[PDB]
Amino acid sequence: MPKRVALGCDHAAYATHQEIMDMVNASGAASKVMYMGPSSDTSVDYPDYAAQVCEAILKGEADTGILVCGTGIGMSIAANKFRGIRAALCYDHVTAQLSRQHNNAHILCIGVRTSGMEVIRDIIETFLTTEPLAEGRHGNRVDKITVIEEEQM
Amino acid sequence: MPKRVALGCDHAAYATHQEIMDMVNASGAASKVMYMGPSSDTSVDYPDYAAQVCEAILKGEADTGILVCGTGIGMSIAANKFRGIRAALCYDHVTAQLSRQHNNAHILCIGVRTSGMEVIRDIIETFLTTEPLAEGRHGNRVDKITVIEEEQM
Amino acid sequence: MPKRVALGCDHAAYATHQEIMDMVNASGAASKVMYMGPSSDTSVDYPDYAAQVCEAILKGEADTGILVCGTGIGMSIAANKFRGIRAALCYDHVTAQLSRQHNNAHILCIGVRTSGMEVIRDIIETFLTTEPLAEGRHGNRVDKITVIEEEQM
Amino acid sequence: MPKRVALGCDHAAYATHQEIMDMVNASGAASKVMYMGPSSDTSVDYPDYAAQVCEAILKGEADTGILVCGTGIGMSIAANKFRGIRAALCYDHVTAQLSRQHNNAHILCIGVRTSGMEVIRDIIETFLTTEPLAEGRHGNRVDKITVIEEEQM
Incomplete structure (x- = not known):
């Protein structure tokens, strides 16, 4: 099923953010793309935008995130x-494929100063269209991550 | 100053773990390397070994980790x-360089099914010899990560 | 149509060459895989094996090569x-995809000390299953490469 | 000794070519940088610009090239x-390092739709400051490439 995507970024991606949103839309795998990075040409702090996208997912406003x-x-x-x-x-x-197949990740994290735009296109399209594998061993590992998080408190 | 390194892995790296430890030692930047992955040819769950290395660092048994x-x-x-x-x-x-310069990371995470061994050598040597940059903006971002973690509880 | 693949390598890939041949066979996209790298644990010179694979293709013994x-x-x-x-x-x-879509390459060249084996799997499977794009601009560029080669003599 | 660099590109790099030239100059390892890609916003064919840079090197107008x-x-x-x-x-x-240490390459080839700009910075700086290794085995392999080229005619 297509997904509701929250896209956040810092200023490193400000120049390219609309190009990235266009990729998400063109992938066919998004029912909605919401931009929650900066809407001005200012320096900003990436944790603040990470938090925006995380909270969108946790509140059920988005299904998946890209940071x-x-x-x-x-x-x-x-x-x-x-x-x-x-x-x-x-x-x-x-x-991109294994982050979904094995780690069942909610959020894709990419670098715009490290990955070129055609590689970012492939990453996005793969992340959004790959499901978690049914073999139980990967889910069990994911469950262990949950146990760690709970213990940390 | 050379660093005390805790190296953990799952079974994906079992075949190569001694080669990796050898790189760490040969880098010149380690005063001690401690292996805390599997010492048998068994399937294991990576979160368990992540936790070993994290706890070594938190207890001051190691300064830095590789997972x-x-x-x-x-x-x-x-x-x-x-x-x-x-x-x-x-x-x-x-x-590797920016994970230290900007994000002042404690732990390097690498993939042995994705990165070849000569790339792993460069990653390790760079991670272990790069210090966090003195410009205040990167530290401030790191401090925001700390605030998020504290709020999550 | 599945392809006849000539695989050549130097000693860097000697340890993994059968694993690579297995990937080629498992891809579904090869009708035959022929190994023309070293069959002993000796140091060798990669140009010699490049030439073997090139000549296989030029004589019509293989359709495509991996080096x-x-x-x-x-x-x-x-x-x-x-x-x-x-x-x-x-x-x-x-x-891998664009080397075929745009450059219509005969030979895939990979590094076993730079790319991990799961990345090599994806590269191989993509290279062997991707066709050259029908837009004329990429073919025209390829034709210019041919003109350069002919002029060089 | 700093090097005389010929930089060529197709239209894929037209938007970023001055940023790339700036990296070359800022590396400290260039005594001159000459741009021989397109000076207009037109579609062009990369082999034509490859040839420009190759011929600059062969005529001794540049020592090294970036394409x-x-x-x-x-x-x-x-x-x-x-x-x-x-x-x-x-x-x-x-x-970048091994293309010089082992293959003693004249020309660095990079992708602007695949590599981000900070990775391109590192590649350029490494390529321009790395010398061919003195162990005879790599030079001997290079000499075999020369023999192939001569035989091809």
Whole structure:
């Protein structure tokens, strides 16, 4: 089923954010794309936009998220600090596919200063169209992540 | 100053783990390397080994960690669930460098089914020898990650 | 139509060559896979094996080639020295796809010390199943490569 | 010794070409940077610009070249068709380093639709500052490439 996508970014992606939104829409796999990054040419702090996208997902306003910074890495760290969210840094087709098949990730994290736009297109299209694999071992690992999060409190 | 490194992995890296430990030692940037992945040829669950390395760092038994799974992504997610830890998935020199310069990451997460061994060598050597940049904006972002983690509780 | 694949490599891929051949066979897109790299654990020179694969293609013993060295780069250079051959270094899905769509490459060049095995699987499967795009501009560029080669003599 | 660099590209890099030239200059490793790609916003054919850069090197107007297309791959193929030129497609630090250490490449080939700009910065700086390794085995392989080229005629 197509997905409701929340897209957040910092200023690193401000120049390209509409191009990225266009990819999401053109993928066929989104029923809605919501932009929650900066709407001005200002420097901003990626954790703040990570939090916007995480909270959209947690409140059921979006099903899936994409977070864009210079490398993806800050986005990945900040998003994973939210209880109930699994955020995957992906930089190619295989990481995009396995972040869904194995890690059943809610959020795709990408870098616009590291990945070119055609690679970002493939990553997005793969992430949005890949389902978590039915073999029980990957789900069991995901459940262990949940146990860690709960224990951390 | 050379660092005390905790290396954890799942079974994806079992075949290569001693080669990876050898890289860490040969880098010149480690005063000690401790292996905390599997010591048998069994299937295991990466979150369990992520937790070992996180807890080594948090207890001051290691200064820095390296976590290895098939892609790095599961390691990144699981490690970031620990309070006080920032875990960076890196797949090249620039991500290794910026994970330290900008995100001041405690843990390097890599994939042995995605990155070849010479790329892993460069990633490791860069991660272990790069310091966090003194411009205040990156530290401020890191502090925001801490605030998120604290709020999540 | 499935393809007849000649696989060549230097000693960098000797440990993994049968795993790579297995991927080619499992792709569904090969009617035959022929190994023309080293069948011993000796150091060898990649141009010699590049030439084997190039000559297989030129004589019609294979339709397509895969060349494996530490990075792919030496293979790419050496193969491209053959008249009538276009050899593409690929390291992800998008380069594999466009090396066929745009550059209509005969030979895939990969690095086993740079690309992990699951990325190599995706590269191979994509390269073998992607056809050259019908828009005339890419073919025209390919024809210009032919003119350069002919002029060089 | 700093190098005289010829930079060529097709229209894929037209938007970013001055940013790339700026990187080359800022690297410290160039005594001159000459742009030989398109100076208009028109569609063009990458082999034509590959040839410009190859001929600059062969005539001694430049010491080294950088060629930029959407992926690098077309540039790599076309440049390698010139007698006396070795052209390396690079997408990270390790490929940049080994393209010089091992393959003693004259031309760096990069993709602006595949590699982000910070990765391109690292690639360029590494390529321009890395010398060919003195162990005889890599030079001997390079000499074999020369023999192939001569035989092809």
